Design a protein around this ligand. Structure first.
Ligand SMILES: *[C@@H]1O[C@H](CO)[C@@H](O[C@@H]2O[C@H](CO)[C@@H](O)[C@H](O)[C@H]2NC(C)=O)[C@H](O)[C@H]1NC(C)=O
Ligand SMILES: *[C@@H]1O[C@H](CO)[C@@H](O[C@@H]2O[C@H](CO)[C@@H](O)[C@H](O)[C@H]2NC(C)=O)[C@H](O)[C@H]1NC(C)=O
Ligand SMILES: *[C@@H]1O[C@H](CO)[C@@H](O[C@@H]2O[C@H](CO)[C@@H](O)[C@H](O)[C@H]2NC(C)=O)[C@H](O)[C@H]1NC(C)=O
Ligand SMILES: *[C@@H]1O[C@H](CO)[C@@H](O[C@@H]2O[C@H](CO)[C@@H](O)[C@H](O)[C@H]2NC(C)=O)[C@H](O)[C@H]1NC(C)=O
Lengths: 388, 388
């Protein structure tokens, strides 16, 4: 009576500590009831590995909590999928990226920041790149017992930015007798800790003028989710302390327009803050920094991401032999890198949103799917062809 | 009998400490002998400022050595030019960027480097951005008394890169009991010093696998001079320790080709080293980093610069009223941002290498120049038009 359709798929990312374990669920309908098979996204079937990966009834793949000694990459750092299948054909779920992380000591550091008196400073909490997916800055603390949290600026001077740095306006000689530590939190173990080192501003008295200089290492392209606040920094030091202006390129041109500052889009010194991000905020930004000696600029690319979703019209159709069958994949989200089609679990080499079979024949019957992907997510829709 | 031509112009950059002072020289020929006037590149005449800027005979602008208290931006952080002029017309020199820097304490730092055991490490000497134009890494030293200099790899393990970092292969638990300091040199004062802090590798035992991760801050576009060795880094950490491959984009496409490693172009772990750089090495490079869990990539832009030079054909010509006069500017160097023309010291709004006057008339007689610029340098050529 019907081919398979998914009712529940697991999300794209399943991250968890060895102590927590995980379970992922897949449910499909169909008649006859489809069998559910777990596969690695490349298509090989996966089995039971004692104490590590267990197929449950209902429809669940279980990763029990496990001791560090028992970590296995092929189980615990793997991209899975669910295959649902009956006599009418097969469909595969979106990719399920499993990342079991053994609970392990890390430290964050705060180093010295060399600044010219009168410039803004940005104090950073350095989190090792290999743990940074799981660790976020909660708050900043000084030796004089001042505590700074994300939200609003303190004393017209200190602001914990959305990206985690502590921004300090108009640094003075005085500010070099303070030391700064960050509190971080690990989302898989839930633990919080203070930074292993404390940083201080080291203030240079301006005795010579200099044109603004920006660091050698700059923010690589950013991907941030819709509806969250974003901060784009522009670190620069010079004397006279410089002024900062932000521009956004017109897509596919070398032309730019001044960013328009309002209730939603604000600038704090050289920092651009955009609340309530929307996909149209994506693009290429330029910060231009000037003083009476000279100027400099740096580009930052921003993509504002939105969850991927897909749906095929029509979800089922019957077409008489020799006649055309059209399936249209309707999708949402940002960015969309690719669209691609499968039939009964096998890529069919069509990468456009509308799939046309010009003249239907027996072996065209079965289940079709459209997958929409980008670098971080995937979404699928399915559809059945019945012969008339 | 003749309009002015420059015999000697000052170079584009004159950098010097307050203790050293500076003198810059401009000589031109012509008949009558041209007068030499020093100007700020925007065109205003400059005068004597007691003890700071003095016009010498011969043809020299002198910046005497001066005490810190006596620094003056309008004298000491300024773009000058020489104007040479007689009854036939005027020519202006290339820009002369003067940067007098008061001798002042700085420190470099070496911070902790968190690495996964078995990966490569790069230990960096952090030089504040506002002094980095004048400070270069000489050498690296450990507490165990090992001294590393630029040139060849030590013990198949340690290499001081052309860009100054200390590269360490295949880090082991053992390597965390060593501490590293850099020796730097300031080119204006000649002094050398060791870093104010020492860094250590902090080694994480790999207990979970992870895909390669690269830092948030990456090398911004590089400009390096012909005939020097360049190193492009690709910092990445993961487990299994990753492999690295470099590609270079085909200009104006999204297509890329594998970099070809040979006698001149080498790879040390993930570091690409190109000796004897040529202008054709310019472009956009991609480093791709892989292990059995996943992959990542980062782009770095390189421009290999070559000194700018310009010459006009013909250097003088006479043309009868109503007939055409053509001047062709021939130039060399890299990059060329602009070409632009002047007549008797005034921009004339032509930005192509060949200048045509379609039908010559009286007030067309005089001196013409072509200037070729990029962001760091300028070069000029001049030519006279005589009426026939
Ligand atoms: C998950 O892995 C870690 C081993 O890192 C386990 O946590 C350790 O447990 C031992 C003994 O109970 C403690 O003494 C260590 O202090 C722990 N280290 C850390 C970093 O927390 C944990 O028991 C494991 N989970 C299991 C096996 O269910
Ligand atoms: C502020 O600084 C920026 C320098 O980065 C200056 O903009 C440049 O201006 C020059 C001269 O007009 C142009 O050729 C460059 O293309 C500009 N760069 C950019 C990124 O726009 C700008 O002129 C400065 N403002 C003042 C008043 O000096
Ligand atoms: C250039 O400027 C610096 C002031 O920074 C002068 O150097 C100082 O000179 C005094 C006394 O001779 C020393 O005690 C300080 O130790 C010096 N400081 C530094 C950083 O070197 C120098 O004399 C000046 N040059 C002149 C006036 O010709
Ligand atoms: C090594 O890692 C890079 C990942 O950055 C992989 O290249 C990507 O491959 C995917 C799948 O083919 C492409 O869609 C991306 O466009 C690729 N990115 C780049 C920058 O080339 C590559 O596949 C990896 N190699 C292996 C064997 O897994």
């Amino acid at each position: 009576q019907k081919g398979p359709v998914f009712l529940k798929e697991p999300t794209n990312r399943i991250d968890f500590s060895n102590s927590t374990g995980a379970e992922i669920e897949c449910k499909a309908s169909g008649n006859p009831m489809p069998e559910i098979i777990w596969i690695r996204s490349d298509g090989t079937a996966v089995g039971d590995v004692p104490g590590l990966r267990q197929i449950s009834s209902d429809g669940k793949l279980v990763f029990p909590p496990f001791r560090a000694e028992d970590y296995r990459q092929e189980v615990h750092a793997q991209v899975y999928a669910c295959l649902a299948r009956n006599q009418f054909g097969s469909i595969i779920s979106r990719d399920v990226h499993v990342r079991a992380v053994v609970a392990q000591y890390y430290e964050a550091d705060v180093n010295k920041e060399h600044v010219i008196r009168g410039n803004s400073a940005v104090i950073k909490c350095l989190i090792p790149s290999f743990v940074a997916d799981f660790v976020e800055v909660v708050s900043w603390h000084t030796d004089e017992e001042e505590n700074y949290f994300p939200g609003a600026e303190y004393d017209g001077k200190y602001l914990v930015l959305p990206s985690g740095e502590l921004h300090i306006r108009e640094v003075g000689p005085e500010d070099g007798y303070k030391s700064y530590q960050c509190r971080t939190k690990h989302r898989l173990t839930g633990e919080t800790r203070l930074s292993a080192t404390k940083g201080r501003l080291v203030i240079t008295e301006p005795i010579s003028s200099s044109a603004p200089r920006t660091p050698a290492l700059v923010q690589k392209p950013l991907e941030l989710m819709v509806a969250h606040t974003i901060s784009l920094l522009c670190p620069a030091q010079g004397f006279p302390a410089p002024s900062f202006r932000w521009y956004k390129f017109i897509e596919g041109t070398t032309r730019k327009q001044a960013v328009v500052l309002n209730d939603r889009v604000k600038q704090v010194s050289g920092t651009l803050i955009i609340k309530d991000a929307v996909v149209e905020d994506s693009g290429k930004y330029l910060c231009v920094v000037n003083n009476s000696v000279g100027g400099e600029s740096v580009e930052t690319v921003l993509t504002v991401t939105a969850p991927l979703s897909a749906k095929i019209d029509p979800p089922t159709q019957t077409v008489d032999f020799g006649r055309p069958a059209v399936f249209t994949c309707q999708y949402t989200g940002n960015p969309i890198k690719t669209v691609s089609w499968m039939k009964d679990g096998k890529a069919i080499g069509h990468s456009e949103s509308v799939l046309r079979i010009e003249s239907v024949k027996k072996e065209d019957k079965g289940m079709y799917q459209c997958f929409v992907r980008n670098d971080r997510e995937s979404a699928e829709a399915s559809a059945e062809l019945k012969l008339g």
